[PDB]
Write an enzyme that holds these catalytic residues in place. Structure first.
Site, short mmCIF file in Angstrom:
data_model
loop_
_atom_site.label_atom_id
_atom_site.label_comp_id
_atom_site.label_asym_id
_atom_site.label_seq_id
_atom_site.Cartn_x
_atom_site.Cartn_y
_atom_site.Cartn_z
N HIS A 161 0.86 -1.17 0.00
CA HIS A 161 0.00 0.00 0.00
C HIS A 161 0.90 1.22 0.00
O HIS A 161 2.10 1.12 0.25
CB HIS A 161 -0.93 -0.01 1.22
CG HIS A 161 -1.83 -1.18 1.32
ND1 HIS A 161 -2.99 -1.33 0.62
CD2 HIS A 161 -1.71 -2.29 2.08
CE1 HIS A 161 -3.53 -2.50 0.90
NE2 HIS A 161 -2.75 -3.11 1.80
N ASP A 174 -1.36 8.79 -1.27
CA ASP A 174 -1.27 9.98 -2.09
C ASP A 174 -2.25 11.01 -1.54
O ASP A 174 -3.44 10.75 -1.41
CB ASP A 174 -1.53 9.64 -3.55
N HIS A 177 -3.92 14.64 -2.20
CA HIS A 177 -4.19 15.63 -3.24
C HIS A 177 -3.80 17.04 -2.79
O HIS A 177 -3.75 17.95 -3.61
CB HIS A 177 -5.68 15.66 -3.62
CG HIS A 177 -6.13 14.51 -4.45
ND1 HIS A 177 -7.40 14.52 -4.99
CD2 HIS A 177 -5.52 13.35 -4.87
CE1 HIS A 177 -7.53 13.42 -5.73
NE2 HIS A 177 -6.45 12.68 -5.63
N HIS A 203 -5.75 9.01 -0.83
CA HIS A 203 -6.08 7.65 -1.16
C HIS A 203 -4.82 6.85 -1.49
O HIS A 203 -3.73 7.40 -1.75
CB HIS A 203 -7.07 7.59 -2.34
CG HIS A 203 -6.58 8.13 -3.63
ND1 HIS A 203 -5.77 7.40 -4.47
CD2 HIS A 203 -6.80 9.32 -4.25
CE1 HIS A 203 -5.48 8.17 -5.55
NE2 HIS A 203 -6.11 9.32 -5.42
N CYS A 204 -4.98 5.53 -1.43
CA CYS A 204 -3.91 4.62 -1.79
C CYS A 204 -3.80 4.61 -3.30
O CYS A 204 -4.79 4.83 -4.01
CB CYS A 204 -4.19 3.27 -1.17
SG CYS A 204 -2.92 2.05 -1.49
N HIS A 239 -7.76 -0.54 -5.06
CA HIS A 239 -7.56 -0.18 -3.67
C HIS A 239 -8.51 0.96 -3.26
O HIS A 239 -9.05 0.95 -2.16
CB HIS A 239 -6.11 0.21 -3.40
CG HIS A 239 -5.16 -0.93 -3.37
ND1 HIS A 239 -4.21 -1.11 -2.39
CD2 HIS A 239 -5.04 -1.98 -4.22
CE1 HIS A 239 -3.53 -2.23 -2.65
NE2 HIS A 239 -4.02 -2.78 -3.75
N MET A 247 -9.83 2.50 0.40
CA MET A 247 -8.63 3.18 0.86
C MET A 247 -8.64 4.64 0.40
O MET A 247 -7.92 5.04 -0.51
CB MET A 247 -7.36 2.42 0.43
CG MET A 247 -7.21 1.11 1.10
SD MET A 247 -5.58 0.39 0.85
CE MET A 247 -4.76 1.36 2.11
N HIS A 293 -27.37 16.59 -1.14
CA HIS A 293 -28.58 17.36 -0.94
C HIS A 293 -29.05 17.11 0.49
O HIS A 293 -29.08 15.96 0.91
CB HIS A 293 -29.64 16.96 -1.97
CG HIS A 293 -30.98 17.60 -1.76
ND1 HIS A 293 -31.35 18.83 -2.23
CD2 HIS A 293 -32.07 17.10 -1.14
CE1 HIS A 293 -32.57 19.12 -1.76
NE2 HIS A 293 -33.05 18.06 -1.16
N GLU A 335 -29.59 24.13 -3.46
CA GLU A 335 -30.44 22.99 -3.13
C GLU A 335 -29.59 21.72 -3.15
O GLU A 335 -29.75 20.87 -2.29
CB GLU A 335 -31.66 22.99 -4.06
CG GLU A 335 -31.39 22.64 -5.53
CD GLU A 335 -32.57 22.76 -6.53
OE1 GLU A 335 -33.66 22.13 -6.28
OE2 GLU A 335 -32.38 23.44 -7.60
N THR A 336 -28.83 21.54 -4.23
CA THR A 336 -28.02 20.35 -4.46
C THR A 336 -26.68 20.84 -4.96
O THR A 336 -26.65 21.81 -5.70
CB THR A 336 -28.77 19.51 -5.51
OG1 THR A 336 -30.04 19.11 -4.96
CG2 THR A 336 -28.00 18.27 -5.87
N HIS A 395 -28.45 13.11 -4.68
CA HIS A 395 -29.74 13.25 -5.32
C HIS A 395 -29.76 12.55 -6.68
O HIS A 395 -30.54 12.92 -7.55
CB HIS A 395 -30.21 14.71 -5.42
CG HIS A 395 -31.68 14.87 -5.33
ND1 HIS A 395 -32.55 14.47 -6.32
CD2 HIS A 395 -32.46 15.40 -4.38
CE1 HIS A 395 -33.80 14.75 -5.96
NE2 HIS A 395 -33.77 15.32 -4.80
#
Ligand SMILES: OC[C@H]1O[C@@](CO)(O[C@H]2O[C@H](CO)[C@@H](O)[C@H](O)[C@H]2O)[C@@H](O)[C@@H]1O
Ligand SMILES: OC[C@H]1O[C@@](CO)(O[C@H]2O[C@H](CO)[C@@H](O)[C@H](O)[C@H]2O)[C@@H](O)[C@@H]1O
Ligand SMILES: OC[C@H]1O[C@@](CO)(O[C@H]2O[C@H](CO)[C@@H](O)[C@H](O)[C@H]2O)[C@@H](O)[C@@H]1O
Ligand SMILES: O=N[O-]
Ligand SMILES: O=N[O-]
Ligand SMILES: O=N[O-]
Ligand SMILES: [Cu+2]
Ligand SMILES: [Cu+2]
Ligand SMILES: [Cu+2]
Ligand SMILES: [Cu+2]
Ligand SMILES: [Cu+2]
Ligand SMILES: [Cu+2]
Lengths: 334, 334, 334
Positions: free
Chosen positions: A87, A90, A92, A127-128, A138, A143, A248, A272-273, A299
């Protein structure tokens, strides 16, 4: 050689978030986190379907890490010898080496320590990402998590007014790909390795079997409903490492929303969304005006109602009849 | 009757872009381009899968055309007699006659010349649109590209500061629909006409078999990796004529992003992942801070890793240990 | 006990919108609407495919309701005894009780009256939401519409300039899930109840069989094309209660677009394609510059051309050769 104060953080399981300050007068620090990888078979629905999960710290999603702009984030990643696969991690939020992935690859029995500087504000996925076809596998096995990098002065609305939240929840949405057998029942497997071939064939068709919050159908309902009171400003951080989502709040709104999740940009108002792009996190804040049950969903209603993607909030306080009222209860048509 | 200077442009194959100025003191001109349609069978993956492609200028995507606001764009479209179908062109940048499509329909052996004025700034899709069910088919067969309309003063950040790029790349993402036979292998066809029936049945199920940059799995990797140096500001223009995409620079960010692709709107800052709506182009700029390999993907990771949608950048320069460092290399758990 | 003037509105079938003022000097009122639920079998394509529809006021989408910020919206919902199922209504514009859904559940033979205050400006979805798996089913069966809440001063561009529309159309996009039998033909059913099992199995695979505007393939074409004249500013309100859409005016642009649909946020300018998140409404305005036929589509072209999602505008006026001209008509290659 980097001479700043060090601060340890005790991570907590989602949807809760470890204690932190919004605006701070502390300067930069090295903030230290530990993540331990756990591979494990888990139940993901109320019918008892199982799934070969791979997780940071035993949870899906992984815990939210909160720091301020200019902090250095020092993560110890641990892959115990009870795991079967390599594993990595990373971020972002981080700059260089594939977000840290190129520096953090560890076999079972190994650990690694990565430090990165938090130069960009917002909420970000981690995330992996071990290489090649392993990367999606993964991630959709669980992950992934997120990290929130706050401005030192806390959040603002883009017109000079401070926005302070009374509480924050982290909702990690997970698309899961569980193969079915000839009779049409979900298959179970003895190891992630054995799940791999059938899971990959299904993944490449792009339709999930389940879409869940916090790792399981119904995870954020009943006793584990999210809570607030009328008058409370609640921040909801929402991540999706692989597939889009459209959050939502049923009966509410997003008063202030960063749908791309980055606090250098002013929030949008009164949504709303909103839309969380696959591979990203966003954040929305709402001040509750009414008591009762709210549902927080994606939604796409098929995903929400039939595939697992629904959470509840239970809100206490006094009903406002000015905002909404049943003028005439259900009755026979005259 | 329109009396302006004329300027010819020699188009170049993507991901490169023909030479142009950002800010200019030239006034409006008539800028002349030629596109020649080529239908051809191409290899799209490393296993040798073939595909009946239809292309502008022999490439997928078609070349990027760059002009300034107020220019007149005069395009000669040529459909040689070696082609089997009628084609046309529709520019999303243009006003009237279905973007030009209603004026540019040509049979094999014919050419046409269209002129349109560039009144709207941004990056825009162009694509073939011959009528009815042919429209999606020609587009997903590869007949799409983009055109960039710059402000005369060049790009700005919305707060009065100039944004100048040191280089620009054009990444065209293509969703492809290749039918499988009973055994489960990809089918090959002798003509686009023969591919039509099976391709249409699969298209209407909405799941691509491949998603590729620049026409082929691995097109922008190895010898054909994109390049930069630490300190360079690179603009990446990304188009998707039919289906959404969620671009992400692994190990980097979008410092300035126009995700809807229109320069009348200020860019967003500091994004991890952005979203290109099907039928649109967007643009992101990033200043590289670290050397090494970066991957540029759509952050549906299944599409990126398993269906073809991954490019590489190779960046030269000096590693910054302040931004990121391996504090402790992989080692046995104490 | 709430002592304001009352105003009745006569709803009209989409794509038309009931008469209203943009900017107004009226103060708050109670605006009264009536919706009557109709379950019915309808034809959705030119091949004669049928579908068990469930509708507000007999139409898909339901009618657009227009009010101003601060109005109180009082809706009478009626479920006649000829219907077979319970229904309710949830307004995304409203605050509390699941948008009204928790207060409006009515069996066949019953009515209910809900009042809510319009505190948030924009366009918003409303839809039926009876509980559990019924929620997606009623929505994708056609029980959705929208409500537009205008600022009292009308729309503005975010830079202090008024934006006034000469006409408004409401385009409701509906994803439909019609099962096929063994031979591959669409199935017909005698009741919504009987359609339920097969429809639910297909819904959970997430791929629609049809995507239509105004309830049917070709509904907004031919005699029922939308219309405008050169020089007219037209507002297009677009809703999608369950699945994303990417509207595009072929041969035009979105001069001013609120893609999240909320008028507290400034519009974006000069878009080619915009994005309507599933569970939301957005609005775009365009001033027509050229006469002729335009097509309004979702720019997933497979959905537009092959699954039903295309409308037409017929625009009258004088051709502008400065904007676009055929320099040389189709001719033999020299
Ligand atoms: O919400 C961010 C948005 O607000 C503006 C002011 O309109 O800047 C504010 O926030 C910045 C980032 O947090 C601060 O650095 C700045 O001091 C504050 O005014 C915009 O510039 C920004 O896009
Ligand atoms: O980045 C575009 C954004 O910037 C603003 C100023 O905030 O205007 C700048 O860019 C315009 C379009 O390029 C120029 O015409 C203008 O002169 C310049 O200040 C915004 O108006 C615009 O949305
Ligand atoms: O278009 C909304 C956008 O415009 C601004 C001014 O930039 O405010 C205008 O619109 C507000 C909401 O309609 C009005 O209340 C305000 O008086 C008017 O200037 C922005 O604040 C807003 O985001
Ligand atoms: O039962 N196996 O597909
Ligand atoms: O082998 N043909 O489907
Ligand atoms: O013909 N029924 O599937
Ligand atoms: Cu892993
Ligand atoms: Cu990633
Ligand atoms: Cu063509
Ligand atoms: Cu188009
Ligand atoms: Cu209903
Ligand atoms: Cu809803």
């Amino acid at each position: 050689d980097l001479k700043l104060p060090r601060q340890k953080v005790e991570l907590v399981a989602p949807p809760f978030v470890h204690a932190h300050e919004q605006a701070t007068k502390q300067g930069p620090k090295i903030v230290e986190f530990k993540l331990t990888i756990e591979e494990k078979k888990v139940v993901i629905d109320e019918k008892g379907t199982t799934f070969q999960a791979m997780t940071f710290n035993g949870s899906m999603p992984g815990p939210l890490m909160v720091v301020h702009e200019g902090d250095y984030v020092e993560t110890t990643l641990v892959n115990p010898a009870t795991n079967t696969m390599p594993h990595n991690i990373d971020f972002h939020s981080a700059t260089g080496a594939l977000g840290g992935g190129a520096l953090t690859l560890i076999n079972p029995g190994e650990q690694v320590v990565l430090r990165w500087k938090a130069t960009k504000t917002g909420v970000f996925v981690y995330h992996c990402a071990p290489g090649g076809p392993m990367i999606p596998w993964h991630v959709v096995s669980g992950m992934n998590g997120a990290v929130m990098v706050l401005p030192r002065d806390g959040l603002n609305d883009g017109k000079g007014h401070a926005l302070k939240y009374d509480k924050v929840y982290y909702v990690g949405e997970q698309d899961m790909y569980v193969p079915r057998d000839e009779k049409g029942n979900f298959k179970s497997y003895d190891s992630p390795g054995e799940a791999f071939t059938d899971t990959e064939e299904m993944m490449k068709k792009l339709i999930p079997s389940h879409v869940v919050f916090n790792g399981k159908v119904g995870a954020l309902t009943g006793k584990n409903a999210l809570t607030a009171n009328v008058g409370e400003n609640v921040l909801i951080v929402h991540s999706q490492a692989n597939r889009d989502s459209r959050p939502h709040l049923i009966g509410g709104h997003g008063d202030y929303v960063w749908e791309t999740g980055k606090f250098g940009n002013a929030p949008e108002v009164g949504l709303e969304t909103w839309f969380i792009r696959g591979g990203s996190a966003g954040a929305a804040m709402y001040k509750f005006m009414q008591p009762g049950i709210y549902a927080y969903v994606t939604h796409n209603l098929i995903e929400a109602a039939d595939l697992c993607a629904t959470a509840h909030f239970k809100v206490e306080g006094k009903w406002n009849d000015d905002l909404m009222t049943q003028v005439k209860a259900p009755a026979e048509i005259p």
